[PDB]
Write a protein that binds this DNA or RNA. Structure first.
Lengths: 114, 114
DNA sequence: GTTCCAATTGGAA
DNA sequence: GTTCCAATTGGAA
């Protein structure tokens, strides 16, 4: 059987095969694995943790990214903080970085498309 | 005629009275107090952890900032990681933030002046 | 010695 | 269909 594991109070799930194979000793890698299991790469590339614009590029024409599903993010934070003993801030920083990483990859694939 | 405590292996010293009263329970607050004891405002407002420009502003001509004394910064990281059980990255982030904060205050006081 | 925060960036390893 | 880093920013609190 392919058993789904509930990772937090909002019942966001990942397969047991994924959950049991996460290295919970490295916060950032655990967070990245959950993210690519729960969200498609396109979502990660076009969304952010908070949905707020960067203060450093105010009055510009950068796309405004919407926030990732808050209930799913809350569950990821729940799981990683309880299993890695990291702070919520540490988990959120890993999500910010992963979203930025996926955005970079999307920009590359768009260049190919022309 | 006071005791100067060495906070790390490079022998960066602060007065014992300052050392004994630092808030070692909050990494960033300990770091900030060490910074204002060890460096003057002008230095904090015009220097950075690495002395390298931001990758986010390469097309702009932002003011250059020199690197804060590495021996002293290494000692600040030593002190805080040992007495607050923070990570080196956490301490360095606190330094980045304090430098940015003092740079902001310098700029504010200029507007205020004229 | 305001203090802390997260979005964006180029590029090393 | 990589991972991680630090400088800059406006603004919450």
């Amino acid at each position: 059987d392919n058993v789904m594991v509930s990772i937090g109070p909002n019942n966001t799930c990942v397969p047991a095969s994924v959950f049991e194979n996460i290295n919970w000793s490295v916060c950032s890698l655990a967070t990245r694995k959950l993210l690519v299991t729960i969200f498609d790469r396109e979502t990660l590339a076009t969304h952010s943790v908070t949905g707020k614009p960067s203060p450093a590029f105010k009055d510009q024409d950068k796309p405004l990214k919407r926030m990732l599903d808050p209930g799913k993010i809350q569950d990821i934070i729940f799981a990683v903080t309880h299993k890695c003993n990291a702070s919520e801030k540490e988990v959120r920083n890993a999500i910010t970085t992963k979203c930025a990483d996926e955005n970079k990859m999307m920009k590359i694939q768009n260049v190919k498309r022309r």
